[PDB]
Design a protein around this motif. Structure first.
Motif, PDB file in Angstrom:
ATOM      1  N   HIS A   1       0.815  -1.208   0.000  1.00 44.66           N
ATOM      2  CA  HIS A   1       0.000   0.000   0.000  1.00 44.66           C
ATOM      3  C   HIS A   1       0.854   1.265   0.000  1.00 44.66           C
ATOM      4  O   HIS A   1       1.422   1.634   1.041  1.00 44.66           O
TER       5      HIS A   1
ATOM      6  N   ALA B   1      -5.431   7.190   6.460  1.00 39.45           N
ATOM      7  CA  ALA B   1      -5.916   5.994   5.813  1.00 39.45           C
ATOM      8  C   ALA B   1      -6.556   5.042   6.788  1.00 39.45           C
ATOM      9  O   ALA B   1      -7.529   4.397   6.495  1.00 39.45           O
TER      10      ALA B   1
ATOM     11  N   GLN C   1      -9.325  -2.986   0.121  1.00 33.52           N
ATOM     12  CA  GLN C   1      -9.727  -1.805  -0.563  1.00 33.52           C
ATOM     13  C   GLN C   1      -8.930  -1.617  -1.836  1.00 33.52           C
ATOM     14  O   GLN C   1      -9.430  -1.065  -2.811  1.00 33.52           O
TER      15      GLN C   1
HETATM   16 CL    CL Z   1      -6.448   4.766   1.695  1.00 36.42          CL
END
Ligand code: CL
Ligand code: CL
Length: 162
Positions: free
Chosen positions: A31, A49, A69
């Motif tokens: 990420h 986040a 996500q």
């Molecule tokens: Cl995010």
């Protein structure tokens, strides 16, 4: 094997902020937090986040939430992209996973630019494609991962991941 397992192998899992292969601040399962050079900036992105003050560390469950996500955004991204959607619709299940992986790594924009490759994907010229994709910064920077992806495109099986 499936898309999650596949990207988990390629990206690994890290619970503390780290620098990717390109030097950018990342966490969890691939990420990207920010391209910026500042750790504080990265710590701020992370808190935003996750929704809490992390101090630069997250839990496994939080890493998996970001991953879920991220995969969902990649798929939707592909499906909304004029150049990508048609390619994706033309593919078999394994190859669709390969395209998702690439998009997760380099973004919609990066992949959408492999113009010549996209054409070959659509024409299903596997061998030509593998050769063309290897002529890229992408392959030169992360060859082992690129080889796994290329074999996937070439054979249409999960062999590289087994
Ligand atoms: Cl995010
Ligand atoms: Cl690599």
């Amino acid at each position: 094997m499936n898309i999650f397992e596949m990207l988990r192998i390629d990206e690994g899992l890290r619970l503390k902020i780290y620098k990717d292969t390109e030097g950018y601040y990342t966490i969890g399962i691939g990420h990207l937090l920010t391209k910026s050079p500042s750790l504080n900036a990265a710590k701020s992105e992370l808190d935003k986040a996750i929704g809490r003050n992390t101090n630069g560390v997250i839990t496994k469950d939080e890493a998996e939430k970001l991953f879920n996500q991220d995969v969902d955004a990649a798929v939707r991204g592909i499906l909304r992209n004029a150049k990508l959607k048609p390619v994706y619709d033309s593919l078999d299940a394994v190859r669709r996973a390969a395209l998702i992986n690439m998009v997760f790594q380099m973004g919609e924009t990066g992949v959408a630019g492999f113009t010549n490759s996209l054409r070959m994907m659509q024409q299903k010229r596997w061998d030509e494609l593998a050769v063309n994709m290897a002529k890229s910064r992408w392959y030169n920077q992360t060859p082992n991962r690129a080889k796994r992806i290329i074999t996937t495109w070439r054979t249409g099986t999960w062999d590289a991941y087994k």
